[PDB]
Amino acid sequence: MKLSARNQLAGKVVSIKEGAVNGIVVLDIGGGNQISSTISMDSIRELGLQVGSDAYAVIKATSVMIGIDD
């Protein structure tokens, strides 16, 4: 599928923290940036995610806030 989400950032899985219904996936997207994703354990298994998997952090633009230094 091709998605409307304005943010689709390629990266490598560096860690997966497993929970009961959700887990947290951390993706190294390069340049010293990492993105954490809280998704269903079901999806983590269905996408075959492991440490080292190539993947994408997918973020709808309406979910992104802008911050600045004080």
Residues near its own copies, by CB under 8 A: 1-9, 17-25, 27, 29-33, 35-40, 42-44, 46-49, 53-70
Pairing assessment for the beta strands 22-30 and 54-59 based on DSSP bridges: unpaired
Q: Which is nearer to its own copies, 42 or 51 (CB)?
A: 42
Q: Which is nearer to its own copies, 19 or 51 (CB)?
A: 19
Measuring CA to CA, which residue among 26, 19, 31, 33 is closest to residue 49?
26
Alpha carbon distance 26, 21 (integer Å): 17
Report, in Å, the least distance between residue 23 CB and its own copies.
Answer: 6
**For residue 36, what are its two tokens?**
């954490």
Q: Which is nearer to its own copies, 51 or 58 (CB)?
A: 58
